[PDB]
Assembly symmetry: none
Homo-oligomer: 61 residues x 6
């Protein structure tokens, strides 16, 4: 009947500092799924499936 939600945070990312000094970064994929280098991600889902970094090789049916 009454909802006084104030300064609420849901799925929040803040204050991130990153440094990546790589001389060689290589990815080789053959028929699959590769997810690499996810940083500072936020989301909110209502009545649904919520993935961030989800890999699936294949779905044979």
């Amino acid at each position: 009947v009454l909802y006084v939600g104030s300064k609420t945070k849901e799925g929040v990312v803040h204050g991130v500092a990153t440094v990546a000094e790589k001389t060689k970064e290589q990815v080789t994929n053959v028929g699959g799924a590769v997810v690499t280098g996810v940083t500072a991600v936020a989301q909110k889902t209502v009545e649904g499936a919520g993935s961030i970094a989800a890999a699936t090789g294949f779905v044979k049916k």
Copy 2:
């Protein structure tokens, strides 16, 4: 009946600092799915499936 949501945050990203010094970055994909280098992403879904960095090799049916 009453909703007084104030200063609410849902799926929020802020204050991000990144440095990437790479001499060589290489990706090789053959028939699959490759997701690389997602940074500072935010979203909100209502009554739906919400992905951010989702890879799927293939869907054979």
Copy 3:
């Protein structure tokens, strides 16, 4: 009937500092699922399955 949620946090990441000095980073995938390098991720799901870094080789049916 009454909900006075104030300064609530649900699925929150903040204050992260990272340094990655790698001379060579290599990934080789053949028909599967590889998830690498997830950092500073937050999410909130309501009535749904919530994954962050979920890998599945394949789903044969």
Copy 4:
């Protein structure tokens, strides 16, 4: 007689990532010297005095 200096670094700063979330930052100075917030500074001096963040109240003579 011979100097084959190669890829030499002297006074070098690189790859810096910073985040500063401050709600209130205040400085009050009365007759002195205040140095605040030096970041990612580099220099090289030859036959001279080299300061970066040097404060001196006063020099009465």
Copy 5:
């Protein structure tokens, strides 16, 4: 007679990540010297006095 200095580093700073979440930062100085918040600084001096964060109240002579 011969100097083959190669890939030499002298006074070098690299790969720094910092996060500072401060609600209130205050400095009050009366007739002195205050040095605050030096980060990721590098220098090289030859035949001279090298300071980075040096404070001196006063020099009465």
Copy 6:
């Protein structure tokens, strides 16, 4: 006569990650010297006095 210095490091700082969550940081100085918060500093001096974070109240002469 011969100097084959290779990959030499002198006064080097690298790979530093810092997080500072302070609710209130206060400094009060009256006629002296205050040095606060030095981080990731490097230097090299040749034939000279090298200080990094040196405080001196005063020099009366």
